[PDB]
Amino acid sequence: NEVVTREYTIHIHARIRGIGSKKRAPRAIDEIKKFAKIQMKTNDVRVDTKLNKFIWSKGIKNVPYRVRVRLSRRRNEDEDSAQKLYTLCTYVPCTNFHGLTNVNV
RNA sequence: AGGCUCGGCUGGAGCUUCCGUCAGUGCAGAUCGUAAUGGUAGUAGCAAAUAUUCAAGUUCGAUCCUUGAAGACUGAAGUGG
C-alpha cells in the first residue's frame, strides 16, 4: 500500500500559464514536483534526469504542453532520513495523449 | 542661591581644615574642537551586460564548491590564446 507506481498525465500548459519566458522550464519542474507531492502524498520528490531532459527538450520557454510521467512511491533506503518515503518521477515517452487516464502499474 | 553635610551601594590609595598668597580657576550655545550615540530604520535599497535546471559527491551545514546530463551565451575587430 506504501510502495506503489502510477502513470499520470500532467497538463504543463495549464500549470505554467503566464510564467515569464526565462522561467518556464524551471517552473515546469517545480509544477511536476508539486503534482507528485499532491497525488502521492510525499514531501520528498526527486525528478529523474531524463524527465528533466524532456522538459528542457525544446529550450527554456517552449515547454511541452503535456508530459506523461510515472510516479513511483518507494521506501527511503536511508534510515536516517526524516521521512520514510519518497517519490521518484520518470519520463514515459508518449505521442498521443488522447484517451489516456491515471493508471496503476 | 552659588553649593554643602551625612546615610546606603561601588571602588581600592590617597585625601583634608584653617591663615596668607598665587592662578592654564566655573560653559548651553561660538555652522565651536574632539570622542561616542540616537530618531530616521530593519527603512532607501542590494533591478545594466539573455539563464539556468536535474541527479550525485563532500560537509554539521550547499542556489553559489566539485562531477555528470541538459539548456543557453561570447561568437575569431571574442567573455579565446
UniProtKB/Swiss-Prot annotation:
<dbReference type="GO" id="GO:0002181">
    <property type="term" value="P:cytoplasmic translation"/>
</dbReference>
<dbReference type="GO" id="GO:0022625">
    <property type="term" value="C:cytosolic large ribosomal subunit"/>
</dbReference>
<comment type="similarity">
    <text>Belongs to the eukaryotic ribosomal protein eL31 family.</text>
</comment>
<dbReference type="Pfam" id="PF01198">
    <property type="entry name" value="Ribosomal_L31e"/>
</dbReference>
<dbReference type="InterPro" id="IPR020052">
    <property type="entry name" value="Ribosomal_eL31_CS"/>
</dbReference>
<dbReference type="InterPro" id="IPR023621">
    <property type="entry name" value="Ribosomal_eL31_dom_sf"/>
</dbReference>
<dbReference type="InterPro" id="IPR000054">
    <property type="entry name" value="Ribosomal_eL31"/>
</dbReference>
<keyword id="KW-0687">Ribonucleoprotein</keyword>
<keyword id="KW-0689">Ribosomal protein</keyword>
<dbReference type="GO" id="GO:0003735">
    <property type="term" value="F:structural constituent of ribosome"/>
</dbReference>
<protein>
    <recommendedName>
        <fullName>Large ribosomal subunit protein eL31</fullName>
    </recommendedName>
</protein>
